[PDB]
Design a protein around this ligand. Sequence first.
Ligand SMILES: CN(C)CCCN1c2ccccc2Sc2ccc(Cl)cc21
Ligand SMILES: CN(C)CCCN1c2ccccc2Sc2ccc(Cl)cc21
Lengths: 158, 158
Amino acid sequence: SVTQTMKGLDIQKVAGTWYSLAMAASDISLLDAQSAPARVYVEELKPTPEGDLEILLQKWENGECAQKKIIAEKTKIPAVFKIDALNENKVLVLDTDYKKYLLLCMENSAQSLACQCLVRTPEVDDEALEKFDKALKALPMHIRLSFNPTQLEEQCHI
Amino acid sequence: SVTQTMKGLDIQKVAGTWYSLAMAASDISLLDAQSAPARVYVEELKPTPEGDLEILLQKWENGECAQKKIIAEKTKIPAVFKIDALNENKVLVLDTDYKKYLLLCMENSAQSLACQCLVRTPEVDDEALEKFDKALKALPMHIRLSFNPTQLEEQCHI
Ligand SMILES: CN(C)CCCN1c2ccccc2Sc2ccc(Cl)cc21
Ligand SMILES: CN(C)CCCN1c2ccccc2Sc2ccc(Cl)cc21
């Protein structure tokens, strides 16, 4: 369903600070409410020395903006990670230059699909957004969002 | 702010049945909740004989999906209509071929801006969506939505 992975991914090199500039999802209800399931705001990507990928992120739960840490285990494919939860959830890195931008998707085999355009600073990278839009033409997305520099510096983008 | 109007608009010819295929807005909160302010689902456009434009639409209010009728008065500019309410609200027709598609925007001078891609049938017109996307490149939109043929036939797109 996501036929776009980064060739030659060096995962150690995605470590550190990231900003969820834009999001997009297969279904409107995955992103429309602040508490919508795919509305996760990346804080930080932390590769483990064994090539697993730890994602630190914020999520609006009930009232507060909550901190969450989730581990995405490595696979044979360098650009694909698994969170064995209620379903097979895969994290796929589509593309990155390591230092400005990183596109990735999360897909639950059930059909549910959300992708993000991550950037290193709180700025609108119009180039990174072009690349994001190009990889989404291929996908059955029905909601897209984008954040301004002010919202990027707030918790949960409020 | 919207520098894209249809040249040579014949307003009588937009009359009758329409479907809100896609929406997009300047701010996420204009479209994110089902009760979000710019989340209006067009039923029908009815030109009056004096060249005023009556919009019949559905809006999710409190619980139910409500019917609403609003009149947009004519101006010197054939493609621009006004709803004199709490602010100057203008309805602008950007483009149409009358028989498949119509792009229009609603703007409140305050900054608040929502645009829609209307189509005549419940079908995904990939061409009409391309034209919609081309007119939005020019605008400071931060949320976009799109509906499937099943949702187009439900009240309020549920
Ligand atoms: C509770 N939330 C931290 C995890 C669920 C949200 N989500 C997600 C987000 C960040 C990292 C991995 C995932 S797995 C996934 C697969 C499909 C969809 Cl649609 C969303 C997600
Ligand atoms: C109560 N709702 C029927 C009218 C308000 C929603 N809305 C709108 C929708 C359909 C026809 C005209 C308008 S004026 C307008 C201007 C700016 C924005 Cl952002 C939204 C709107």
